Amino acid sequence: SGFRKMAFPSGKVEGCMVQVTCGTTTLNGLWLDDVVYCPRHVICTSEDMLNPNYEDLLIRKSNHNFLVQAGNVQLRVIGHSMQNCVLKLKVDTANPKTPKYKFVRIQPGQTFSVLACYNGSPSGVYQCAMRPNFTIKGSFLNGSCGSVGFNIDYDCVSFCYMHHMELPTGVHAGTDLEGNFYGPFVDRQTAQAAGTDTTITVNVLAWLYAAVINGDRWFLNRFTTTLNDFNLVAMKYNYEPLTQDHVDILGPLSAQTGIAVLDMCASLKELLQNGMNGRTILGSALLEDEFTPFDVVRQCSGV
Amino acid sequence: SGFRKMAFPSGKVEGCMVQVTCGTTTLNGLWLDDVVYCPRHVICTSEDMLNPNYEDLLIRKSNHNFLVQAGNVQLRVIGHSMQNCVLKLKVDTANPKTPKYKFVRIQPGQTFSVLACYNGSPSGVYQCAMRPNFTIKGSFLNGSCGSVGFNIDYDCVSFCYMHHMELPTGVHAGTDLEGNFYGPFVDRQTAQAAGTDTTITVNVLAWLYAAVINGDRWFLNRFTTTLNDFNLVAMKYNYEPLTQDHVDILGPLSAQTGIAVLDMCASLKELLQNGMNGRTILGSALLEDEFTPFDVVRQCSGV
Numbered sequence: 001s002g003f004r005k006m007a008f009p010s011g012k013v014e015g016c017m018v019q020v021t022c023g024t025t026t027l028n029g030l031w032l033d034d035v036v037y038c039p040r041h042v043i044c045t046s047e048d049m050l051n052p053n054y055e056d057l058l059i060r061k062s063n064h065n066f067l068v069q070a071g072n073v074q075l076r077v078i079g080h081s082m083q084n085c086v087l088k089l090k091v092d093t094a095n096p097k098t099p100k101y102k103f104v105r106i107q108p109g110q111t112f113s114v115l116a117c118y119n120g121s122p123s124g125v126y127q128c129a130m131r132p133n134f135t136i137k138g139s140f141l142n143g144s145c146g147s148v149g150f151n152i153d154y155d156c157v158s159f160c161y162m163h164h165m166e167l168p169t170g171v172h173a174g175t176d177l178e179g180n181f182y183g184p185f186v187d188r189q190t191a192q193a194a195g196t197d198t199t200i201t202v203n204v205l206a207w208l209y210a211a212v213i214n215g216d217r218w219f220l221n222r223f224t225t226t227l228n229d230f231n232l233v234a235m236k237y238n239y240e241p242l243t244q245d246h247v248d249i250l251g252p253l254s255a256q257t258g259i260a261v262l263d264m265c266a267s268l269k270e271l272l273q274n275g276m277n278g279r280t281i282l283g284s285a286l287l288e289d290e291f292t293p294f295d296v297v298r299q300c301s302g303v
Numbered sequence: 304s305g306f307r308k309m310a311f312p313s314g315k316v317e318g319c320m321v322q323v324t325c326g327t328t329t330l331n332g333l334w335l336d337d338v339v340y341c342p343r344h345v346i347c348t349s350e351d352m353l354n355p356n357y358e359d360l361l362i363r364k365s366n367h368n369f370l371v372q373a374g375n376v377q378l379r380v381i382g383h384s385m386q387n388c389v390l391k392l393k394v395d396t397a398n399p400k401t402p403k404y405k406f407v408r409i410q411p412g413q414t415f416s417v418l419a420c421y422n423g424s425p426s427g428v429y430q431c432a433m434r435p436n437f438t439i440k441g442s443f444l445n446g447s448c449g450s451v452g453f454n455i456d457y458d459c460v461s462f463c464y465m466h467h468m469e470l471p472t473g474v475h476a477g478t479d480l481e482g483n484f485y486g487p488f489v490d491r492q493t494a495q496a497a498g499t500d501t502t503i504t505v506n507v508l509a510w511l512y513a514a515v516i517n518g519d520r521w522f523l524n525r526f527t528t529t530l531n532d533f534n535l536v537a538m539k540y541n542y543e544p545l546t547q548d549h550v551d552i553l554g555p556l557s558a559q560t561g562i563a564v565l566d567m568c569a570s571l572k573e574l575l576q577n578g579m580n581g582r583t584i585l586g587s588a589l590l591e592d593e594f595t596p597f598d599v600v601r602q603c604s605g606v
């Protein structure tokens with residue numbers, strides 16, 4: 001019992017974090033096998049960052065201009081290339097702590113663990129969702145660029161995020177490990193705005209199931225609805241439209257609780273229209289959308 | 304920018320978690336040097352748990368009745384003793400992954416990271432406070448007993464909590480690593496109730512400073528107050544009384560923001576009396592008390 005925002009254990013990722021320095025700029029890199037991954041803006045001077053030509057800035061850079069440091073030890077850079085918005089530095093030593101891993105580009109609404117790092121050293125770990133507007137609600141200071149997001153499947157680390165930037169609303173944007181931004185963001189110091197911050201409906205439903213599993217059922221009402229009827233109300237509150245695929249994903253939680261998804265949708269509809277009347281659900285006063293159905297099942301079944 | 308509930312990186316603690324089995328009961332233990340620590344109720348049958356005599360139950364137990372398993376490997380138990388509500392199992396192998404560590408009994412209002420474990424394997428990591436009523440708001444299932452809470456000071460792990468039980472309100476209770484419960488709880492299957500859940504005032508103040516640091520200052524009003532005036536309102540809302548020691552601890556955040564602690568107390572007073580008017584502070588609709596002043600400074604300064 002109880003329900004918390006829970007990160008993956010970070011040990012396997014801690015052993016991959018290094019410091020990368022190019023001139024005066026020090027950020028985080030990810031050391032897997034004989035390659036270090038880091039944001040390409042490590043090569044920028046404070047003036048370059050205004051409107052950089054990365055191709056031109058790389059003409060000026062050689063292997064020896066990248067200092068890679070793994071705790072107290074200097075790694076030897078024997079190659080470098082740019083892939084989209086990431087630099088890949090080939091080093092002469094395979095990381096002996098390299099876990100089983102893969103690179104994934106995550107879908108909007110999916111969650112991952114962030115290991116916030118400074119100067120190649122772990123600060124802390126917390127869970128984030130890739131929001132529909134391709135931003136995340138993180139906690140990142142100067143020095144955090146190159147911090148990574150990940151999931152763990154038993155022993156395999158799925159790396160899905162590399163931290164690059166902060167946006168006006170105090171939210172964050174970054175790339176997959178192939179250097180492609182989530183969203184329409186670019187790695188330059190120009191004003192960029194997040195689009196409408198739509199709510200992940202299927203995750204709100206999942207969290208309401210979690211509330212029922214933990215004995216909090218005050219908000220279950222006597223109504224049901226239809227997908228089309230619910231979605232008319234969703235669009236009004238900038239909720240993602242619910243589809244049969246979403247209903248299917250909530251199936252195991254519906255089965256566990258004996259509450260049909262469309263009955264839970266009806267309860268969600270009345271919470272949207274009437275608010276919580278100063279009551280709380282799993283210790284929250286607002287509707288939480290950063291738990292996936294899998295996060296709920298995992299937590300409630302001890303995976 | 305941004306502000307999140309952040310756990311310590313868990314790698315150094317992951318390497319200490321083992322499975323302990325006594326008969327049909329399997330729980331978590333903590334392997335440091337040549338000693339495994341676990342809850343003494345590992346020795347209880349499902350009937351024993353109703354009113355156990357632990358001293359008598361231990362007459363029946365020998366070294367060979369404790370199965371300790373570290374991943375795939377069986378450790379050899381060469382000694383056992385009970386210290387308060389914990390068992391200490393002496394094994395013939397020092398844990399080679401033992402970090403620098405200490406055992407601390409934490410004060411009410413202080414925070415720590417929990418590594419939730421099942422069958423000796425890490426499930427996830429999240430931050431908790433030791434509440435004034437000596438309970439924590441965790442996420443624990445059957446199998447989680449022996450999961451530990453900790454802080455990290457640079458390289459040194461301070462272990463402060465071992466998980467034993469759940470309470471009616473869906474909150475949790477456990478011991479320090481010397482086997483002494485936080486609070487008046489006992490390790491037996493009898494109905495136990497948490498006392499009044501008082502709010503950690505100094506931590507709410509800290510979180511309001513965090514809000515100001517992150518540009519959220521809508522709730523700063525034109526008033527100041529006195530310790531005694533504030534405390535009259537505190538006691539009404541079951542807040543901890545504020546003392547000069549609390550003011551001194553908030554000093555660095557006051558200095559950082561240029562908001563005198565007693566001005567922030569006046570803002571807190573009006574939030575208690577008037578509520579948030581459906582507004583939010585750092586993405587929350589209620590007053591958060593599980594961040595210490597140190598948690599705020601650490602997060603806002605990249606420690």
Ligand SMILES: *[C@](O)(C(=O)NC1CC1)[C@H](C[C@@H]1CCNC1=O)NC(=O)[C@H](CC(C)C)N1C[C@@H](NC(=O)OCc2ccccc2)CC1=O
Nearest residue numbers: 041049140141142143144145164165166187188189190191
């Ligand atoms: C990382 O580059 C970083 O940590 N660098 C290490 C060397 C110190 C940094 C992380 C940010 C900084 C604060 N919190 C974070 O997450 N990222 C940047 O500074 C971004 C640099 C670009 C990728 C080149 N960056 C640029 C900045 N953009 C900006 O100022 O645009 C103009 C603007 C005008 C008005 C209002 C707002 C913005 C945001 C950003 O993160």
Ligand SMILES: *[C@](O)(C(=O)NC1CC1)[C@H](C[C@@H]1CCNC1=O)NC(=O)[C@H](CC(C)C)N1C[C@@H](NC(=O)OCc2ccccc2)CC1=O
Nearest residue numbers: 344352443444445446447448467468469490491492493494
């Ligand atoms: C741990 O013992 C555990 O994980 N054991 C491993 C072998 C499976 C367990 C953890 C709990 C279980 C669910 N979530 C948790 O955190 N702890 C217990 O089961 C406690 C056992 C005692 C320490 C011996 N325990 C006893 C139970 N008490 C109880 O039922 O009292 C009567 C009551 C009456 C009415 C209403 C409520 C309670 C609570 C508890 O955690």
